[PDB]
């Protein structure tokens, strides 16, 4: 495992109109549809975490009724997440991560390291894993572990929800150029997140933790991630003729 002594830096930003996802699997075209459910409230107070050579900011966060997660980076620093209750070896936990070539999901009783992290493509997440009920590849997506110089260029947004023992993952990727010194801020406008994966984990999830990769010298890279909590609300969605 990796002993990280770097401190943590976080700030509070506005959610704007982010976190909109398709509420159903029913085709809706040229219609304004009302929806009561768990959504990220507009203009809400969300937590923005920033990492640099001297700052490693990962903490256990509550899952609650669902989580809006976004990463604003340029070097694929966020590799995935751990979901569960105690996040220890008295219960099963969900490990969702990119191994470098494939997105993999593992549901086992993992004894995770105090700070589970990847050392330059080298994994140091859990000391041991047993009682595995799920272990498979979700998708083939090449994500490099190289360090890109310059400004951030893309925001990747995720919505995590639990429904009938299944972890539902919604996703959207949008180009977002943000300078390293520029004020911490989410993009403006609505970007609908599409249903990406429905994973049958059968587990109770109350807490989650983010997984990041450090440099070969175990130093943190330049990256930012945002955590918001879904709340019960009625939202109105405008569908075009295509159904978007």
């Amino acid at each position: 495992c990796v002993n990280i002594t770097y401190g943590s830096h976080h700030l509070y930003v506005s959610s704007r109109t982010r976190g909109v996802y398709y509420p159903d699997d029913a085709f809706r075209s040229s219609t304004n549809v009302l929806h009561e459910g768990f959504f990220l409230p507009f203009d809400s107070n969300v937590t923005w975490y920033s990492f640099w050579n001297q700052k490693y900011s990962v903490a256990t966060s509550p899952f609650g009724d669902g989580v809006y997660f976004s990463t604003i980076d340029k070097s694929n620093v966020v590799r995935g997440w751990v979901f569960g209750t105690t996040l220890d070896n008295d219960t099963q936990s969900v490990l969702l991560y990119n191994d470098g070539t494939h997105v993999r999901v593992e549901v086992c009783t993992f004894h995770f390291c105090p700070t589970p992290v990847f050392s330059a493509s080298s994994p140091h997440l859990y000391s041991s894993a047993f009682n595995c009920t799920l272990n498979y590849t979700l998708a083939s997506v090449r994500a490099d572990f190289t360090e890109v110089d310059g400004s951030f260029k893309t925001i990747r947004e995720f919505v995590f929800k639990l429904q009938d023992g299944s972890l539902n993952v919604y996703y959207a990727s949008t180009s977002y150029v943000l300078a390293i010194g520029a004020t911490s801020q989410l993009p403006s406008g609505v970007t609908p997140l599409v249903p990406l994966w429905k994973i049958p984990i059968g587990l109770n999830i109350t807490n989650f933790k983010t997984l990041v990769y450090l440099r070969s010298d175990n130093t943190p890279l330049q990256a930012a991630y945002v955590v918001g909590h879904l709340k019960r609300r009625t939202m109105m969605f405008k569908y075009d003729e295509n159904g978007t």
């Binding site: 699997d25 085709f27 075209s29 040229s30 219609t31 008295d90 219960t91 099963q92 009783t109 009682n131 009920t133 009938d164 023992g165 299944s166 049958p200 059968g202 587990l203 109770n204």
Partner: protein, 194 residues
Amino acid sequence: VSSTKLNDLCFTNVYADSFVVRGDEVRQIAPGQTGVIADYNYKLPDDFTGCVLAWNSRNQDASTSGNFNYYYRIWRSEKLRPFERDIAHYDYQVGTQFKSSLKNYGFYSSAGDSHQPYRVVVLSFELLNAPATVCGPKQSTELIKNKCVNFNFNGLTGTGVLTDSNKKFQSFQQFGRDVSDFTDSVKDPKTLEV
């Protein structure tokens, strides 16, 4: 879904849940049931779409000396949610004594049907606008165009005239609908033509 219609339907996703219970606990594998199995071992959602199949497994899971390889939970601080699984080993307090939350079944081949082992298989069905992967053994006919016909495409039935479409479909889209919710278009599962 009606059991008689399963042979005429197609499903986007099918999940098979498999476990062993005692004969008198098979009734608890159904929505809105209350009991040791329904509360602390296996809960179905109230809006469940699927089929529950069960059979006496005395010949494979009961023995003369007794089979004690099957376990069930007797206590959980809270009830399980639909499709939730708890595989953790923990003790609960009864008065001043701690007892295992897991108990062993004793399946004897000489017991009555109520105490015989039953194998249960729960088929959860997903029916979405997506590629069909599980279908019934229905024979496909020839496509008849430009006439009023009764049609059945991947389980979706209806009456209408089938014509060549200039409409373009997304990669996994199987059918198209309008504001009225009328199915105005379909992708043929054999020719991939809209």
